[PDB]
Short mmCIF file of C-alpha atoms (C1' of nucleotides) and ligand atoms in Angstrom, two decimals:
data_model
loop_
_atom_site.label_atom_id
_atom_site.label_comp_id
_atom_site.label_asym_id
_atom_site.label_seq_id
_atom_site.Cartn_x
_atom_site.Cartn_y
_atom_site.Cartn_z
CA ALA A 932 154.04 133.18 191.04
CA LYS A 933 155.48 130.80 188.31
CA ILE A 934 156.48 127.23 189.72
CA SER A 935 157.91 125.23 186.56
CA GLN A 936 161.14 124.86 185.56
CA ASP A 937 159.69 125.12 182.21
CA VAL A 938 158.64 128.89 182.28
CA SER A 939 160.05 131.75 182.11
CA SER A 940 159.74 135.37 184.09
CA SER A 941 162.42 136.72 181.59
CA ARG A 942 161.66 140.11 180.37
CA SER A 943 163.90 139.81 177.45
CA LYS A 944 162.59 136.21 176.24
CA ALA A 945 158.94 137.45 176.77
CA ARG A 946 159.27 140.18 174.87
CA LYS A 947 161.52 138.16 172.17
CA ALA A 948 158.74 135.50 171.75
CA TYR A 949 155.90 138.53 171.30
CA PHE A 950 157.83 140.02 168.62
CA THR A 951 159.05 137.24 166.60
CA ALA A 952 155.74 134.78 166.99
CA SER A 953 154.71 133.26 163.78
CA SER A 954 151.39 134.13 162.26
CA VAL A 955 149.75 131.04 163.77
CA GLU A 956 150.90 131.45 167.17
CA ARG A 957 149.58 135.39 166.32
CA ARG A 958 145.94 134.36 165.97
CA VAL A 959 146.01 133.25 169.79
CA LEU A 960 148.12 136.50 170.84
CA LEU A 961 145.10 138.60 169.01
CA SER A 962 142.63 136.81 170.71
CA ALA A 963 138.79 138.95 172.15
CA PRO A 964 136.89 138.87 174.94
CA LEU A 965 132.68 138.10 174.35
CA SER A 966 130.65 140.65 174.87
CA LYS A 967 128.16 139.59 178.21
CA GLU A 968 125.41 138.56 175.72
CA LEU A 969 127.91 136.07 174.07
CA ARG A 970 129.53 134.93 176.92
CA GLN A 971 125.94 133.19 178.54
CA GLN A 972 125.33 132.64 174.99
CA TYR A 973 127.94 130.08 174.44
CA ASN A 974 129.46 129.70 178.00
CA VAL A 975 132.92 131.17 176.61
CA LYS A 976 135.08 134.44 178.04
CA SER A 977 137.50 134.97 174.96
CA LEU A 978 138.43 133.51 171.38
CA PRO A 979 140.65 134.43 168.89
CA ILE A 980 139.61 137.29 166.87
CA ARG A 981 138.54 135.98 163.43
CA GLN A 982 137.61 138.04 159.85
CA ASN A 983 134.36 138.45 159.90
CA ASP A 984 133.38 138.60 163.65
CA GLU A 985 131.82 141.81 164.54
CA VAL A 986 133.16 143.53 167.67
CA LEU A 987 132.61 146.63 169.82
CA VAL A 988 135.10 148.88 170.97
CA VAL A 989 135.69 149.36 174.10
CA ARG A 990 138.83 151.48 174.47
CA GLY A 991 141.03 154.45 173.24
CA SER A 992 139.44 157.24 171.24
CA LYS A 993 136.72 155.20 169.03
CA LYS A 994 135.60 153.88 172.72
CA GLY A 995 131.84 152.81 171.12
CA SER A 996 132.17 152.31 167.25
CA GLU A 997 131.13 149.10 166.13
CA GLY A 998 131.37 147.38 162.70
CA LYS A 999 132.56 144.06 161.20
CA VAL A 1000 136.62 143.06 161.50
CA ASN A 1001 138.01 143.38 157.76
CA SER A 1002 141.11 141.71 158.31
CA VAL A 1003 143.38 140.07 161.26
CA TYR A 1004 146.14 141.99 160.01
CA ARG A 1005 148.36 139.81 162.08
CA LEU A 1006 151.76 141.28 160.63
CA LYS A 1007 150.87 144.59 162.31
CA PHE A 1008 149.53 142.87 165.56
CA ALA A 1009 145.77 144.64 165.03
CA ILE A 1010 142.16 144.67 163.62
CA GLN A 1011 140.71 146.76 160.97
CA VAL A 1012 137.51 147.47 161.59
CA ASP A 1013 134.56 148.06 158.83
CA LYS A 1014 134.32 152.03 159.20
CA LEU A 1015 136.70 152.37 161.17
CA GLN A 1016 138.63 154.85 158.96
CA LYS A 1017 140.81 157.68 159.86
CA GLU A 1018 140.47 160.58 156.46
CA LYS A 1019 143.74 162.03 155.60
CA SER A 1020 144.14 165.51 154.21
CA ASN A 1021 144.94 164.00 150.68
CA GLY A 1022 141.47 162.86 150.78
CA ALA A 1023 141.89 159.06 151.20
CA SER A 1024 141.01 157.04 153.68
CA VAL A 1025 143.35 154.62 155.87
CA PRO A 1026 141.98 152.05 158.58
CA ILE A 1027 142.35 152.50 161.50
CA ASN A 1028 143.99 149.70 163.36
CA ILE A 1029 142.89 148.21 166.42
CA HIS A 1030 144.34 146.30 169.71
CA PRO A 1031 141.80 142.89 170.14
CA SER A 1032 141.79 142.58 173.45
CA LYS A 1033 140.62 146.51 173.32
CA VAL A 1034 137.61 145.08 171.72
CA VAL A 1035 134.36 143.22 172.82
CA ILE A 1036 133.22 140.55 169.85
CA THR A 1037 130.00 140.90 170.12
CA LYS A 1038 128.82 138.85 167.11
CA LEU A 1039 130.32 135.18 166.15
CA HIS A 1040 131.27 134.54 162.71
CA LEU A 1041 131.10 130.64 162.97
CA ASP A 1042 131.66 127.64 160.71
CA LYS A 1043 132.13 123.91 161.97
CA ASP A 1044 135.40 124.98 163.55
CA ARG A 1045 134.54 127.55 165.03
CA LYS A 1046 131.67 125.82 166.97
CA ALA A 1047 134.40 122.76 167.91
CA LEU A 1048 136.38 125.26 169.60
CA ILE A 1049 134.04 126.66 171.45
CA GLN A 1050 132.87 123.16 172.58
CA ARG A 1051 136.20 122.39 172.95
CA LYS A 1052 136.54 125.33 175.68
CA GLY A 1053 133.40 123.76 177.02
CA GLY A 1054 131.13 126.03 176.02
CA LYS A 1055 127.81 125.56 173.56
CA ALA A 1056 127.85 126.47 170.35
CA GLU A 1057 124.70 124.35 168.19
"C1'" A B 829 182.30 207.90 168.02
"C1'" A B 830 181.46 203.14 164.78
"C1'" A B 831 184.14 198.98 163.17
"C1'" C B 832 186.92 195.30 165.72
"C1'" U B 833 188.48 192.07 169.84
"C1'" U B 834 186.81 190.01 174.12
"C1'" U B 835 183.09 188.30 177.86
"C1'" C B 836 177.88 187.57 179.55
"C1'" A B 837 172.87 186.29 178.31
"C1'" A B 838 168.78 184.76 175.30
"C1'" C B 839 167.35 182.76 170.76
"C1'" A B 840 168.61 180.32 166.23
"C1'" A B 841 173.75 177.23 164.86
"C1'" C B 842 177.64 172.95 164.98
"C1'" G B 843 177.86 168.16 167.39
"C1'" G B 844 175.91 164.12 170.04
"C1'" A B 845 176.93 164.27 175.24
"C1'" U B 846 172.94 163.69 179.02
"C1'" C B 847 168.90 161.00 180.78
"C1'" U B 848 165.61 157.13 180.16
"C1'" C B 849 165.39 152.41 177.22
"C1'" U B 850 167.30 147.01 175.26
"C1'" U B 851 164.40 140.58 170.48
"C1'" G B 852 172.02 141.70 172.33
"C1'" G B 853 176.23 140.56 175.52
"C1'" U B 854 178.99 138.46 179.61
"C1'" U B 855 179.17 134.42 183.62
"C1'" C B 856 176.60 130.93 186.27
"C1'" U B 857 173.32 126.34 187.12
"C1'" C B 858 170.36 122.46 184.96
"C1'" G B 859 169.32 118.27 181.18
"C1'" C B 860 170.98 115.81 176.33
"C1'" A B 861 174.28 112.56 173.16
"C1'" U B 862 173.14 113.28 167.14
"C1'" C B 863 178.28 114.98 161.77
"C1'" G B 864 180.07 112.36 157.11
"C1'" A B 865 181.54 107.82 150.82
"C1'" U B 866 173.09 106.35 152.30
"C1'" G B 867 178.53 112.17 150.49
"C1'" A B 868 179.39 116.00 155.74
"C1'" A B 869 181.31 121.03 157.10
"C1'" G B 870 182.71 124.59 153.82
"C1'" A B 871 182.67 127.03 148.73
"C1'" A B 872 180.46 128.70 143.63
"C1'" C B 873 176.02 129.82 141.03
"C1'" G B 874 171.42 130.25 140.61
"C1'" C B 875 165.97 130.29 142.62
"C1'" A B 876 160.71 135.19 143.68
"C1'" G B 877 154.57 138.32 139.40
"C1'" C B 878 157.69 142.75 140.52
"C1'" G B 879 164.57 142.08 145.00
"C1'" A B 880 170.47 144.22 145.72
"C1'" A B 881 171.28 142.37 150.43
"C1'" A B 882 170.29 139.34 154.59
"C1'" U B 883 167.18 134.84 155.64
"C1'" G B 884 165.40 130.16 152.86
"C1'" C B 885 165.84 126.92 149.05
"C1'" G B 886 168.58 124.15 144.46
"C1'" A B 887 166.54 123.39 137.49
"C1'" U B 888 160.22 120.07 141.78
"C1'" A B 889 165.11 126.14 143.45
"C1'" C B 890 162.24 132.23 149.69
"C1'" G B 891 160.85 125.63 148.14
"C1'" U B 892 157.33 119.77 146.31
"C1'" A B 893 154.67 115.14 149.60
"C1'" A B 894 152.94 114.12 154.56
"C1'" U B 895 151.03 115.38 159.59
"C1'" A B 896 148.55 119.27 162.14
"C1'" U B 897 145.43 123.32 162.41
"C1'" G B 898 142.05 126.41 160.78
"C1'" A B 899 141.36 131.96 157.58
"C1'" A B 900 144.60 134.14 155.95
"C1'" U B 901 149.02 137.16 152.93
"C1'" U B 902 149.69 142.09 152.80
"C1'" G B 903 154.57 147.43 150.38
"C1'" C B 904 151.71 146.74 145.59
"C1'" A B 905 149.36 143.13 142.29
"C1'" G B 906 146.61 138.80 141.21
"C1'" A B 907 143.91 134.00 140.39
"C1'" U B 908 142.11 128.88 135.08
"C1'" A B 909 142.92 130.42 144.96
"C1'" U B 910 139.92 129.74 149.10
"C1'" U B 911 135.25 129.52 153.07
"C1'" C B 912 129.79 124.43 157.97
"C1'" G B 913 136.17 122.49 154.12
"C1'" U B 914 140.98 117.39 151.47
"C1'" G B 915 140.13 123.66 153.13
"C1'" A B 916 143.50 130.36 153.06
"C1'" A B 917 148.35 130.78 155.26
"C1'" U B 918 152.07 128.31 158.31
"C1'" C B 919 160.76 125.80 157.91
"C1'" A B 920 153.10 124.33 163.17
"C1'" U B 921 155.28 119.27 162.79
"C1'" C B 922 158.01 116.40 160.11
"C1'" G B 923 158.80 110.34 159.04
"C1'" A B 924 158.39 110.88 151.88
"C1'" A B 925 161.42 113.47 148.29
"C1'" U B 926 163.88 117.04 144.88
"C1'" C B 927 168.94 118.56 146.39
"C1'" U B 928 172.45 122.68 140.04
"C1'" U B 929 178.85 122.76 139.95
"C1'" U B 930 181.88 121.13 144.16
"C1'" G B 931 184.00 120.02 148.41
"C1'" A B 932 187.09 114.06 152.65
"C1'" A B 933 185.62 113.74 146.71
"C1'" C B 934 185.93 108.96 143.52
"C1'" G B 935 186.61 107.82 135.10
"C1'" C B 936 191.66 111.46 134.14
"C1'" A B 937 192.61 116.54 134.12
"C1'" C B 938 191.23 121.23 136.51
"C1'" A B 939 194.45 128.95 135.76
"C1'" U B 940 190.38 124.42 130.72
"C1'" U B 941 182.37 124.59 132.42
"C1'" G B 942 189.28 119.82 129.05
"C1'" C B 943 188.94 114.39 127.31
"C1'" G B 944 188.12 109.20 127.69
"C1'" C B 945 186.20 104.65 128.08
"C1'" C B 946 181.82 100.73 128.96
"C1'" C B 947 175.94 99.02 128.88
"C1'" U B 948 171.14 100.08 127.34
"C1'" C B 949 167.79 102.43 124.64
"C1'" U B 950 167.32 106.07 120.41
"C1'" G B 951 168.29 109.72 115.89
"C1'" G B 952 170.70 110.26 111.40
"C1'" U B 953 171.03 104.88 104.84
"C1'" A B 954 175.89 102.28 110.84
"C1'" U B 955 178.84 95.91 115.51
"C1'" U B 956 183.14 100.59 113.89
"C1'" C B 957 181.54 107.64 112.64
"C1'" C B 958 178.43 111.86 114.97
"C1'" G B 959 174.24 113.76 117.98
"C1'" G B 960 170.77 112.96 122.31
"C1'" A B 961 168.91 110.56 126.74
"C1'" G B 962 169.51 107.29 131.01
"C1'" G B 963 172.33 104.41 133.76
"C1'" G B 964 178.60 103.19 134.99
"C1'" C B 965 184.39 103.24 135.39
"C1'" A B 966 189.12 106.24 142.29
"C1'" U B 967 191.95 104.06 146.41
"C1'" G B 968 194.11 101.08 150.50
"C1'" C B 969 192.23 96.92 153.32
"C1'" C B 970 188.47 92.81 154.96
"C1'" U B 971 185.49 87.69 153.74
"C1'" G B 972 184.29 85.45 149.39
"C1'" U B 973 184.06 83.90 143.66
"C1'" U B 974 186.38 82.61 139.50
"C1'" U B 975 190.55 83.32 136.45
"C1'" G B 976 195.41 82.51 137.00
"C1'" A B 977 201.65 82.16 137.71
"C1'" G B 978 205.67 79.60 140.22
"C1'" C B 979 210.38 72.81 139.36
"C1'" G B 980 207.78 76.19 146.32
"C1'" U B 981 206.16 71.17 146.23
"C1'" C B 982 202.72 66.16 146.14
"C1'" G B 983 200.68 62.22 143.38
"C1'" U B 984 200.84 59.27 138.41
"C1'" U B 985 202.90 58.12 133.33
"C1'" U B 986 206.62 57.64 129.69
MG1 LIG C 848 172.84 156.22 178.21
MG1 LIG C 849 195.94 124.32 129.91
#
RNA sequence: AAACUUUCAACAACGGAUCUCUUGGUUCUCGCAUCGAUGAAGAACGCAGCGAAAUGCGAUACGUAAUAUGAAUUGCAGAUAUUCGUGAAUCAUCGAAUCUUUGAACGCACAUUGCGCCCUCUGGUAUUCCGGAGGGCAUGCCUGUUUGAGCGUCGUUU
């Protein structure tokens, strides 16, 4: 149960804050858990998904698929994986949208800011 | 006997009830004190690579600066855009700016994009005319400055 007077248990307020979330807020909302191998490598359990991460799909019809994130399509609350494509009868392929909470990050795209973020969260980066 | 009329059932119509939802409303409580001549509230007209509206903004026009953050935006397109970084996106934050024509609305006027005057600079052979750029000119009242008015009145000299 929540104790703080600054926390709201309102369903309408919580949903409004989600669907009207800014792009910067949606980066944190689109977090993904790390795989077991990366969790012991970095001592961090989840990170906001980023463009050049590699993920393994763990839920849905594409469970077991792997690929590199192509875009964190923050407007649709989804990520698009490298070769997770649906082929229309037209012959054209549209990417399949997957929520980041339904994948595990298997390889991180690292830069000076990701490492500081991992070290900020108590982990180890380099 | 058909057709026709009426009733019922099945399927299809017409229509949008019912059910289930809900970024809305309503009411209660808690906390706070912050509009404007330093130009408000409001109005009009504009502004996007491709927009009519809503939203945002003002010729720096769906925004400029700054701080933070840290890879997007996305319907399509596109960098003389970006990725171990003064660096994508961001009304995230916001302390610097821009802020058209107006509006208490202030040169005068306004059913007009009407008409002046002053200062500096500038173009046309120009203190005077015509053009342009920038800066100014409302009213009531207060304090002060300067210039004044009145046999209202004080001193002095014929
Ligand atoms: Mg209902
Ligand atoms: Mg007239």
